[PDB]
Design a protein around this ligand. Sequence first.
Ligand SMILES: Oc1ccc(Oc2c(Br)cc(CC(O)O)cc2Br)cc1C(O)NCCc1ccccc1
Length: 239
Amino acid sequence: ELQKSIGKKPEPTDEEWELIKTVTEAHVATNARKFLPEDIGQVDLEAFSHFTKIITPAITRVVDFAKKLPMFCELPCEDQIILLKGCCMEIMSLRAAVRYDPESETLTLNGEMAVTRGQLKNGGLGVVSDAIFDLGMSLSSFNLDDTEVALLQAVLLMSSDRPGLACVERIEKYQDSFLLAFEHYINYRKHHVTHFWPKLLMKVTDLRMIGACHASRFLHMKVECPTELFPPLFLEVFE
Ligand SMILES: Oc1ccc(Oc2c(Br)cc(CC(O)O)cc2Br)cc1C(O)NCCc1ccccc1
């Protein structure tokens, strides 16, 4: 914070280089093409089908990342549950968004399937599609590596704001540790875009929205499409 007054812009402590070693390994371990015909999407029940055939593995990989982080494993059992449930979609939207490519204008879902904005949207996501795309478009320019996505993810995971969490103080603290190892890692990367870090923290807000905006969306679907249509893990994590 005095280093912050002098504009010293520090790079990570050795102790911190550990944290970066782990989240990037946890992340690369679990981050994983085929264009889904313009045929599908163009509620579409066939777009519905194709995107829920593949979401159960996506969710486990997001869990497998949290398992690989040891700060996560220090938490009581009902708290672990609660975090995973919160960021599950948040983490998931980012993971897709950074795999935008503007030539085709497609994301890559689950690391295989390549969807346009209308295709993802018509399978039941509505504006939650537009949010994940608009985002991936903006992150085109930020040029994130596995380590930054990893840390962003680890910031999302450790969100003491979740309803019914018990170990708030400790989780918050863990989070500040990722944010500090993250900001120091940005400093170290020297990105050519003024206020890179402020700009990047607003992506946390937008991802937080998407997750929310997806839960609401999921209530509009529960109405018309019965619960029977939904992969049992998806249900356990979004209900
Ligand atoms: O719910 C979803 C969540 C993610 C999704 O795309 C993905 C998938 Br699949 C996986 C991931 C993680 C990854 O890319 O590895 C991100 C994203 Br974005 C597609 C749907 C989807 O089309 N389901 C529609 C049924 C439904 C569910 C919730 C709300 C509204 C409608």
